Amino acid sequence: TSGIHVLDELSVRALSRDIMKQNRVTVHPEKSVPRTAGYSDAVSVLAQDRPSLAIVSGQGGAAGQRERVAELVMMAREQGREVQIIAADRRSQMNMKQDERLSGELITGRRQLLEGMAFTPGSTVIVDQGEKLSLKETLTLLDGAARHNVQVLITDSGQRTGTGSALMAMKDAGVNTYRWQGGEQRPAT
Numbered sequence: 799t800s801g802i803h804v805l806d807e808l809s810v811r812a813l814s815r816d817i818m819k820q821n822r823v824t825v826h827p828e829k830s831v832p833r834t835a836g837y838s839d840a841v842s843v844l845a846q847d848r849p850s851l852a853i854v855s856g857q858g859g860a861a862g863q864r865e866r867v868a869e870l871v872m873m874a875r876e877q878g879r880e881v882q883i884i885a886a887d888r889r890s891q892m893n894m895k896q897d898e899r900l901s902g903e904l905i906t907g908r909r910q911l912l913e914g915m916a917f918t919p920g921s922t923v924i925v926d927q928g929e930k931l932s933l934k935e936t937l938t939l940l941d942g943a944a945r946h947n948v949q950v951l952i953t954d955s956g957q958r959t960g961t962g963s964a965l966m967a968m969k970d971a972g973v974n975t976y977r978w979q980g981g982e983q984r985p986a987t
Contacts (some may be wrong), residue, residue: 920948940973
C-alpha cells in the first residue's frame with residue numbers, strides 16, 4: 799500500500815512519452831522554437847526519482863548540450879556518488895577537456911579496465927549520443943554495473959526522423975536480461 803507512488807518503471811514511462819511529444823513537436827523552420835530545457839526538465843525529474851532511464855533528442859546546440867547533461871552529474875557530486883557519462887562522437891575531444899569532474903573518477907574504471915578485477919557497482923550512467931556506435935560500446939560495460947545500483951539515461955541527435963528505431967539500437971548492443979544473469983557474459987554476442 800505505502801511506497802506505491804513510484805514503481806520500477808511507471809515514473810519513467812510517463813516522462814518518456816511527454817519528451818517524445820516535443821521530439822517531433824510541430825515546429826516550422828521559418829520560425830523554429832528552441833526548447834533544450836524541454837527534455838532537461840522531464841528527464842532531470844526522473845533522476846530525482848531513482849531508476850535513471852529515459853529517451854531525449856536535441857534540436858539545436860551541440861557544445862552546450864554535452865555540458866548540460868554533465869550538470870546532472872553535479873547532482874550526484876553532492877550525493878557522494880560519481881557517474882559515467884558519454885557524449886556523442888564529440889566526447890573524444892571532451893576527454894582532452896572536461897577536467898572539471900570527469901578527469902578519472904567514474905567508479906569501476908580503475909582495476910576492471912586495467913587489471914581485470916571488479917569494482918563495487920553503484921554508479922549512475924547517462925550517455926548522450928547522436929552516433930549510435932558510442933551507445934553500443936558504453937552499453938556492454940554498463941551491463942555489469944547495472945546489475946547493482948546503475949541505470950542508463952541517454953539522449954540522442956539522430957532520432958529527429960526515427961526515434962523508436964533508436965530504442966532497439968541500444969538493445970542490439972548486447973544488453974539482454976534473461977533471469978539469473980543478464981548480458982554480462984555476452985561481451986560481443
